[PDB]
Design a protein around this ligand. Structure first.
Ligand code: MG
Length: 408
């Protein structure tokens, strides 16, 4: 099949496999997959369960038309009223909704809770809302238990609008992360890990860079502050420091493999950064061949102008780029044709928890779309050999994760 036929097939399968037809939100499996990936990777943020009792009544009293129409109306309201980065909005039941808000503190979660209540108020007992503030990585069983208690508390005392639970640890503000990151950038406190992405034979396609730094014997990883830098607009300050450092180790002459650097969405949106990247890569043209710039899919779909500027400047200096979280935005896959990325890193959603028939088709279709263009398909966070062999039957060619990090 040609691209447009293949891409449209991939977008159809992705919609039928992970989206609720009526609400057009994520379905039950989507919510289940999103929850497991966020909890196992960071678990920092908030999760909420909205029990739209008024939708339940319409289904039992007025029929499917009334309930369906109200589900769609509330779904569009939530989808438009809660614009939070990397948020997950899913319909986990006929009248229940699950929301995942990564990297959000209790004060921001409680604001979103009143916003979800305001959505229901605009669309005329009515609801029960349970909000859980999560600080550390835990099991999906433990978090779902906390949500179940958050709901119980909202019903136990309807003197409040929503039940709130926190588990457990006084966190850091956004400006506190900035001064903390700027200090690590000041003294070169940052440590770098290189996770290899290999083919089934062990051929290293590239190594994704992971950053961390220490203070007081406490270790902070990039995903603990990357959002605060973006929300403070200062994400370019960190991405420039990483690129500078990665160029040094490349100029030590030892690393023969390309290095993948994650570029923040808020970094490419800044014209100063795209200028800074073209000057840096011009004065380090020797090692640009070993530079892979991992662009999130959000930049291609929502900032295609700056991304085209960044991609053009990157490829005219000998470097290349790839798509990170490929397919995650549930939008058009056209940009694969217009940008022709060197690789696509499939999002966690389309690679894990493939328990249903249609999920596997979506993987093959979404992967063929890039494969049939000569674009290397990569699956990350691959933790098992049986997982690797399974993904290789669905047009995944490069693998990254625990199975690669255990070998030798
Ligand atoms: Mg990445």
């Amino acid at each position: 099949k040609a691209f447009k036929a293949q891409a449209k097939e991939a977008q159809q399968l992705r919609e039928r496999a992970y989206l609720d037809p009526v609400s057009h939100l994520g379905n039950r499996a989507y919510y289940m997959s999103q929850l497991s990936g966020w909890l196992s990777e960071s678990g920092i943020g908030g999760v909420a369960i909205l029990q739209a009792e008024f939708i339940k009544e319409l289904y039992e009293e007025k029929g499917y038309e009334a309930g369906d129409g109200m589900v769609r109306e509330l779904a569009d309201r939530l989808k438009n009223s809660i614009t939070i980065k990397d948020i997950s909005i899913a319909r986990i039941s006929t009248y229940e909704f699950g929301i995942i808000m990564p990297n959000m503190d209790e004060t921001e979660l409680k604001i979103v809770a009143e916003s979800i209540i305001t959505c229901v108020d605009d669309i005329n007992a009515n609801l029960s809302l349970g909000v859980v503030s999560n600080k550390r990585q835990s099991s999906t069983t433990t978090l779902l238990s906390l949500l179940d208690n958050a709901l119980a508390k909202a019903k136990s005392n309807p003197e409040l609008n929503y039940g709130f639970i926190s588990s457990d640890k006084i966190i850091l503000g956004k400006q506190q992360w900035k001064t903390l990151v700027e200090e690590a950038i000041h003294n070169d406190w940052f440590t770098f890990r290189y996770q290899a992405a290999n083919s089934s034979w062990g051929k290293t396609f590239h190594r994704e860079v992971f950053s961390a730094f220490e203070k007081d014997g406490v270790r902070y990883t990039a995903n603990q502050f990357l959002f605060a830098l973006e929300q403070l607009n200062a994400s370019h300050i960190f991405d420039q420091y990483v690129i500078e450092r990665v160029i040094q180790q490349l100029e030590k002459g030892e690393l023969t493999d390309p290095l993948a650097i994650n570029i923040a969405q808020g970094s490419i949106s800044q014209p100063s950064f795209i200028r800074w990247i073209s000057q840096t890569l011009s004065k380090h043209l020797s090692v640009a061949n070993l530079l892979h710039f991992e662009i999130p899919e959000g930049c291609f779909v929502n900032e295609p102008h700056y991304t085209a500027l960044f991609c053009n400047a990157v490829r005219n200096a000998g470097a290349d780029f790839g798509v990170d979280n490929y397919g995650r935005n549930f939008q058009s896959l056209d940009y694969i044709n217009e940008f022709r990325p060197k690789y696509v890193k499939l999002d966690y959603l389309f690679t894990h928890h493939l328990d249903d028939e249609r999920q596997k088709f979506t993987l093959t279709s979404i992967s063929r779309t890039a494969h049939n263009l000569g674009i290397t398909t990569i699956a990350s966070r691959v933790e098992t050999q049986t997982q690797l062999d399974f993904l290789s039957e669905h047009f995944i060619e490069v693998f990254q994760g625990f199975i690669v990090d255990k070998a030798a």
